[PDB]
Design an enzyme around this catalytic site. Structure first.
Site, PDB file in Angstrom:
ATOM      1  N   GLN A 165      -2.075  -5.266  -7.989  1.00  0.00           N
ATOM      2  CA  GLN A 165      -3.184  -4.746  -8.643  1.00  0.00           C
ATOM      3  C   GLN A 165      -3.748  -5.520  -9.465  1.00  0.00           C
ATOM      4  OE1 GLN A 165      -5.620  -2.746  -8.478  1.00  0.00           O
ATOM      5  NE2 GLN A 165      -5.196  -0.750  -9.544  1.00  0.00           N
ATOM      6  N   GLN A 166      -4.835  -5.561 -10.035  1.00  0.00           N
ATOM      7  CA  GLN A 166      -5.755  -6.601 -10.702  1.00  0.00           C
ATOM      8  C   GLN A 166      -6.477  -5.653 -11.820  1.00  0.00           C
ATOM      9  OE1 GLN A 166      -6.997 -10.413  -8.611  1.00  0.00           O
ATOM     10  NE2 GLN A 166      -8.083  -8.681  -7.689  1.00  0.00           N
ATOM     11  N   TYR A 167      -6.421  -5.839 -13.037  1.00  0.00           N
ATOM     12  CA  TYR A 167      -7.173  -5.070 -14.144  1.00  0.00           C
ATOM     13  C   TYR A 167      -8.301  -5.899 -14.768  1.00  0.00           C
ATOM     14  CZ  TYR A 167      -3.381  -1.831 -13.579  1.00  0.00           C
ATOM     15  OH  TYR A 167      -2.607  -0.800 -13.294  1.00  0.00           O
ATOM     16  N   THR A 187      -9.263  12.539  14.451  1.00  0.00           N
ATOM     17  CA  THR A 187      -8.110  12.488  13.669  1.00  0.00           C
ATOM     18  C   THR A 187      -8.493  13.027  12.252  1.00  0.00           C
ATOM     19  OG1 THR A 187      -6.752  11.189  15.144  1.00  0.00           O
ATOM     20  CG2 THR A 187      -6.105  11.221  12.545  1.00  0.00           C
ATOM     21  N   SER A 246      -7.111   9.087 -13.084  1.00  0.00           N
ATOM     22  CA  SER A 246      -6.442   8.712 -12.058  1.00  0.00           C
ATOM     23  C   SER A 246      -4.988   9.480 -12.335  1.00  0.00           C
ATOM     24  CB  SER A 246      -6.084   7.201 -11.206  1.00  0.00           C
ATOM     25  OG  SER A 246      -5.351   7.347 -10.251  1.00  0.00           O
ATOM     26  N   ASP A 274      -9.225   6.319  10.227  1.00  0.00           N
ATOM     27  CA  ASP A 274      -8.845   6.401  11.609  1.00  0.00           C
ATOM     28  C   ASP A 274     -10.284   7.146  12.184  1.00  0.00           C
ATOM     29  OD1 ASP A 274      -7.585   6.213  14.170  1.00  0.00           O
ATOM     30  OD2 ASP A 274      -6.032   7.451  13.478  1.00  0.00           O
ATOM     31  N   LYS A 280      -8.190   8.306   1.335  1.00  0.00           N
ATOM     32  CA  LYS A 280      -8.327   6.972   2.143  1.00  0.00           C
ATOM     33  C   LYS A 280      -8.446   7.178   3.675  1.00  0.00           C
ATOM     34  CE  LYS A 280      -5.500   5.764  -0.622  1.00  0.00           C
ATOM     35  NZ  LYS A 280      -5.507   5.863  -2.333  1.00  0.00           N
ATOM     36  N   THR A 294      -7.003  12.744  -7.652  1.00  0.00           N
ATOM     37  CA  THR A 294      -5.549  13.221  -7.139  1.00  0.00           C
ATOM     38  C   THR A 294      -5.289  12.240  -6.086  1.00  0.00           C
ATOM     39  OG1 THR A 294      -6.563  14.836  -5.419  1.00  0.00           O
ATOM     40  CG2 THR A 294      -5.947  15.627  -7.659  1.00  0.00           C
ATOM     41  N   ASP A 346      -7.994  11.007  -3.313  1.00  0.00           N
ATOM     42  CA  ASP A 346      -8.007   9.723  -3.006  1.00  0.00           C
ATOM     43  C   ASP A 346      -7.221   9.497  -1.566  1.00  0.00           C
ATOM     44  OD1 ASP A 346      -8.054   7.018  -2.816  1.00  0.00           O
ATOM     45  OD2 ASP A 346      -7.392   6.651  -4.888  1.00  0.00           O
ATOM     46  N   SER A 399      -9.358  -3.193  -5.724  1.00  0.00           N
ATOM     47  CA  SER A 399      -9.135  -3.739  -6.667  1.00  0.00           C
ATOM     48  C   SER A 399      -8.151  -4.818  -6.490  1.00  0.00           C
ATOM     49  CB  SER A 399      -8.553  -2.837  -7.688  1.00  0.00           C
ATOM     50  OG  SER A 399      -7.601  -1.862  -7.049  1.00  0.00           O
ATOM     51  N   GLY A 409      -5.833   4.665 -14.242  1.00  0.00           N
ATOM     52  CA  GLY A 409      -4.381   5.633 -14.245  1.00  0.00           C
ATOM     53  C   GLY A 409      -3.402   5.204 -15.169  1.00  0.00           C
TER      54      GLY A 409
END
Ligand SMILES: N#Cc1cn([C@@H]2O[C@H](COP(=O)(O)O)[C@@H](O)[C@H]2O)c(=O)[nH]c1=O
Ligand SMILES: N#Cc1cn([C@@H]2O[C@H](COP(=O)(O)O)[C@@H](O)[C@H]2O)c(=O)[nH]c1=O
Lengths: 257, 257
Positions: free
Chosen positions: B208-210, B99, B35, B95, B92, B60, B90, B150, B228
Site C-alpha cells: 500500500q502507498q499513501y 459469473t 473504508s 471475471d 472488485k 464495505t 468494494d 494505489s 481506512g
C-alpha cells in the site's frame, strides 16, 4: 523433452500442492477441472460426488451459493478426500496485500480453511501475493496467478501476461501455476489451467469464448481444462464429464508423444 | 473553470446515483469515504452511526465480516438513509459477465440488494460491466471501474488505464466513475474516488502507498478520498474522520478557486 504429469510431480522444485495434484492426475487419467457454478449446496455436493472420479479438481464460487455454511465445505472436503480431487476456489483476489490477507483467512467463507488452491489477479502488483502467502503458507495451500483470461476484450495480454509469469516465478513457495489460455511459463513445475473450454466452437452472450480441449491442451500446451456449462447443462453430466476427460487426457498424451 | 459538486449533480449526462452523491457531498461538506475494514458487525454499525454525518460514502468489504447477515445490512441501510451517505461494496468483480452477474445478485451476500455502488476490474474486458449492468440497471445501482490502483507494482497504468476510461464512457448508463489515483477522465459526469490516502505520506508493509488529501484532491484532481486505517486505527474515530473530512473538503475548495 516434455515430462509426464507423474514425473513433473517429482521435480526438485515442485510445490507439495502441485505434486499432490499431478500424482492424482496421473493415477486417475484426468486433467479435467469441473466448474461447479451452482446456487445450492446440495447441487455442489451431488455433482462433486457423482463426477469426483472423473475430475482432478473441483472449482467453486462459494459466493454464488445461496446456502453456504462451513458445514457444506466440511462435507465437500470429505468428497475431495474420497474421490481424490483438489478444491480450487475461484476467488480472484485482486487488491492490496493487507486486504486480500483478510479476505483469504477471515469473514464467513474462511477460504484458506478448505481451499487447496485459490487464484489472484496480478493487476495490484506483487503485494497481492505477499498478503495471500501470509495465510496460505501456514495452511499448506497454493495459488494460481491469472496470466490470461478467456473473455473478449481481455487486457491480460502481452506485457501484463509477462508480469504474471515473473511474479509467479519469484513467489514459487506459494504460486503453483496459472490461469491462462496457453502455456505461458517454460518451467515445468508450474501448472497451466484453462477455462473457456467446450467441445464445440462458440461463446456466450456476455463475452465468454470457447476453444476445444484439443486446441488448448494439445496445440496451446495447457495442462488442465476447466469446464462448467459444457458439463452442467448436459442431460447426462456423467457422460459429458467423461467426454471432456477423455478429450483432455488424449490431447495431453498426444503432445507427450 | 471547475464545477462545484452541486453543479456537477446537474450535468446533462449525470447518473442518478452520482447525482444523489454529489448533492449530499455539497450539503454535508464532505468528500470523505470511510473504508470500514472491520470484522465485527457491531463495530461496522457503531462506526456508520458515529461517522455518518462526516462521510459521503461508506465502503464495505462484507466478506471480511465474521458475523455478516442480511439483517446487518438492513441496519446499515437505515443508517445510510438517516445520515445520508451511499454504501459502496468494494467487491472488485473481475471475471466473465456470466459469473459476475450471479456474484452481484446472488449467493449469501445479495450485494445488489443493499449496495448503491460496486466496483469492477476491467481486465476481463467489457463483458464484466455488461454482466453487472444486467442486474444493476433495474435497481438503479451504479458501478466504478478500477482505472488505477494505489499499490506498489500496480499494472493499472498506461493503456490499461485508457481502456478503463473508454469502457466507462461506453457504459455511462451504469458506470458512474472510477477508482483511481488521479483524475483520469475529463468528463465531469464521472466521479474519481481515490484510496491510498493518509495525512502522513508513506505506506504499509504489503505494497500500500499513501498520499495526502491535499495531494490527491488538490493536486491530482480526484473527487473523494477513501480512507481506512488512517481513521479506523485512531482511538477516536470521529475526530479522525473530521480531520480527513476537513482536509479533503478544503483541498477541493482550493482547487475550485
Ligand atoms: N481467472 C479466470 C477465469 C475464470 N473463468 C471461470 O471459469 C468458469 C467457466 O465456466 P463455463 O464458461 O460455464 O465453462 C466460470 O466459473 C468462470 O467464472 C473463466 O471462464 N475465464 C477466466 O479467464
Ligand atoms: N480498486 C481498488 C483499491 C481498493 N483499495 C481499498 O481501499 C482501502 C484502503 O484502506 P487503508 O489502506 O486502510 O486506507 C482498503 O479497503 C483497500 O482494500 C485500495 O487501497 N487500493 C485500491 O487500488
Amino acid at each position: 523433452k516434455e515430462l509426464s504429469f507423474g514425473a513433473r510431480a517429482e521435480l526438485p522444485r515442485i510445490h507439495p500442492v502441485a505434486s499432490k495434484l499431478l500424482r492424482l492426475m496421473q493415477k486417475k487419467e484426468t486433467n479435467l477441472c469441473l466448474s461447479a457454478d451452482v446456487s445450492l449446496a446440495r447441487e455442489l455436493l451431488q455433482l462433486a460426488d457423482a463426477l469426483g472420479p472423473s475430475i482432478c479438481m473441483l472449482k467453486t464460487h462459494v459466493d454464488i451459493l445461496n446456502d453456504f455454511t462451513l458445514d457444506v465445505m466440511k462435507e465437500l472436503i470429505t468428497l475431495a478426500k474420497c474421490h481424490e480431487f483438489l478444491i480450487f476456489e475461484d476467488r480472484k483476489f485482486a487488491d492490496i496485500g493487507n486486504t486480500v490477507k483478510k479476505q483469504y483467512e477471515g469473514g464467513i467463507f474462511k477460504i484458506a480453511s478448505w481451499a487447496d488452491l485459490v487464484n489472484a489477479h496480478v493487476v495490484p502488483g506483487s503485494g497481492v501475493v505477499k498478503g495471500l502467502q501470509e495465510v496460505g503458507l501456514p495452511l499448506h495451500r497454493g495459488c494460481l496467478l491469472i496470466a490470461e483470461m478467456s473473455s473478449t476484450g481481455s487486457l491480460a495480454t502481452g506485457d501484463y501476461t509477462r508480469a504474471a509469469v515473473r511474479m509467479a516465478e519469484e513467489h514459487s513457495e506459494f504460486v503453483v501455476g496459472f490461469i491462462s489460455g496457453s502455456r505461458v511459463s517454460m518451467k515445468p513445475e508450474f501448472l497451466h489451467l484453462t477455462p473457456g473450454v467446450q467441445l464445440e466452437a462458440g461463446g456466450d452472450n456476455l463475452g465468454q469464448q470457447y476453444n476445444s480441449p484439443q486446441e488448448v491442451i494439445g496445440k496451446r500446451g495447457s495442462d488442465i481444462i476447466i469446464v462448467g456449462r459444457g458439463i452442467i447443462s448436459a442431460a447426462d453430466r456423467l457422460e459429458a464429464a467423461e467426454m471432456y476427460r477423455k478429450a483432455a487426457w488424449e490431447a495431453y498424451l498426444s503432445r507427450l508423444g
